[PDB]
């Protein structure tokens, strides 16, 4: 994820947008983590019985 | 039962619609300070696709 190189003069709006991006990044961490866990968990729970 | 099959197919469609609505909500709440729109996104979604769907962005 590449944040746009925007220089926002207002230090109060910029900090908010810094927070708003910190929230967005945290989501993308867990979206990747949960996607991995769900796939591994389901395959790691139902694959052996089929085989 | 045909009614049960039709309801099942409708539920699958509605789940697909939930996923699509999540994606559309993610796209909607984007600003130039957090995402950069690729040129292909422009030329597709703001020029070509709207024409096919009869939308004709006012672009005033």
Swiss-Prot record, chain A:
Q: Where are the transmembrane segments?
A: 29-47
- Record's superkingdom? Eukaryota
The entry's localization annotation reads: Synaptic cell membrane; Cell membrane
Q: Which purpose does this protein serve, as stated in its record?
A: Component of neuronal acetylcholine receptors (nAChRs) that function as pentameric, ligand-gated cation channels with high calcium permeability among other activities. nAChRs are excitatory neurotrasnmitter receptors formed by a collection of nAChR subunits known to mediate synaptic transmission in the nervous system and the neuromuscular junction. Each nAchR subunit confers differential attributes to channel properties, including activation, deactivation and desensitization kinetics, pH sensitivity, cation permeability, and binding to allosteric modulators.
What clinical condition does the entry mention? Epilepsy, nocturnal frontal lobe, 1: An autosomal dominant focal epilepsy characterized by nocturnal seizures with hyperkinetic automatisms and poorly organized stereotyped movements.
- Relate the assembly described in the record: Neuronal AChR is composed of two different types of subunits: alpha and beta. CHRNA4 forms heteropentameric neuronal acetylcholine receptors with CHRNB2 and CHRNB4, as well as CHRNA5 and CHRNB3 as accesory subunits. Found in two major stoichiometric forms, LS (low agonist sensitivity): (CHRNA4)3:(CHRNB2)2 and HS (high agonist sensitivity): (CHRNA4)2:(CHRNB2)3, the two stoichiometric forms differ in their unitary conductance, calcium permeability, ACh sensitivity and potentiation by divalent cation. Cells produce predominantly an (CHRNA4)3:(CHRNB2)2 nAChR.
Q: Which family does it belong to?
A: Belongs to the ligand-gated ion channel (TC 1.A.9) family. Acetylcholine receptor (TC 1.A.9.1) subfamily. Alpha-4/CHRNA4 sub-subfamily.
What's the name of the protein? Neuronal acetylcholine receptor subunit alpha-4
Which lineage?
Answer: Eukaryota, Metazoa, Chordata, Craniata, Vertebrata
From Swiss-Prot, chain B:
Partners and quaternary state? Neuronal AChR is a heteropentamer composed of two different types of subunits: alpha and beta. CHRNB2/Beta-2 subunit can be combined to CHRNA2/alpha-2, CHRNA3/alpha-3 or CHRNA4/alpha-4, CHRNA5/alpha-5, CHRNA6/alpha-6 and CHRNB3/beta-3 to give rise to functional receptors. CHRNA2:CHRNB2 and CHRNA4:CHRNB2 nAChR complexes exist in two subtypes: LS (low agonist sensitivity) with a (CHRNA2/4)3:(CHRNB2)2 and HS (high agonist sensitivity) with a (CHRNA2/4)2:(CHRNB2)3 stoichiometry; the subtypes differ in their subunit binding interfaces which are involved in ligand binding.
Its name, as the record gives it, is Neuronal acetylcholine receptor subunit beta-2
- Part of the full-length chain shown: 295 to 354 of 502
Q: Write down the disease named in this UniProt entry.
A: Epilepsy, nocturnal frontal lobe, 3: An autosomal dominant focal epilepsy characterized by nocturnal seizures with hyperkinetic automatisms and poorly organized stereotyped movements.
**For this UniProt entry, which segments traverse the membrane?**
3-27
Compartments in which it is found: Synaptic cell membrane; Cell membrane
- Record family assignment: Belongs to the ligand-gated ion channel (TC 1.A.9) family. Acetylcholine receptor (TC 1.A.9.1) subfamily. Beta-2/CHRNB2 sub-subfamily.
Entry function: Component of neuronal acetylcholine receptors (nAChRs) that function as pentameric, ligand-gated cation channels with high calcium permeability among other activities. nAChRs are excitatory neurotrasnmitter receptors formed by a collection of nAChR subunits known to mediate synaptic transmission in the nervous system and the neuromuscular junction. Each nAchR subunit confers differential attributes to channel properties, including activation, deactivation and desensitization kinetics, pH sensitivity, cation permeability, and binding to allosteric modulators.
